[PDB]
Amino acid sequence: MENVVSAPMPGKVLRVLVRVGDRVRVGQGLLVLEAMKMENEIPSPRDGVVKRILVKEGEYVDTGQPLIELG
């Protein structure tokens, strides 16, 4: 059951913290989203493997936009 991490709010991708193929833990930061005058680390919802990274540093995203797919 692959699943997708989508943006919970609009903002700018400031940093991507993982690479395709990385093992991740639940709660691990996948990227940093600039929003509400803060940096916001967007978490993995579960243990797994990063299958796809769908955004790049510098990119603006909106709510519901797919960011990361887990395998």
Numbering used by the authors: 79 to 149
Q: Any passages from the paper?
A:
In the PhBCCP system (PhBCCPΔN79) residue 138 was selected as the target residue for the mutation experiment because it is a solvent-exposed and nonconserved residue on a surface β-sheet. The isoleucine mutant (A138I) and the tyrosine mutant (A138Y) conferring residue 138 with the highest crystal-packing propensities for β-sheet provided better crystallization scores when compared with other constructs, including the wild type. The A138I mutant and the A138Y mutant produced another orthorhombic crystal form belonging to space group C2221 and a trigonal crystal form belonging to space group P3121, respectively. The crystal structures of the A138I and A138Y mutants were determined at resolutions of 1.9 and 1.5 Å, respectively. In these mutant crystals the crystal-packing interface involving residue 138 differs completely from those of the other two crystal forms. Neither the C orthorhombic nor the trigonal crystals could be obtained with the wild-type protein. Therefore, it is conceivable that the substitution of Ala by Ile/Tyr with a better crystal-packing propensity created novel packing interfaces. On the other hand, the crystal packings of the A138I and A138Y mutants are rich in attractive electrostatic interactions and nonpolar interactions, respectively. The numbers of nonpolar interactions normalized by the total buried ASA for the three crystal forms were calculated as 0.108 Å−2 for the wild type, 0.099 Å−2 for the A138I mutant and 0.135 Å−2 for the A138Y mutant. The order of the normalized number of nonpolar interactions corresponds to that of the resolution.
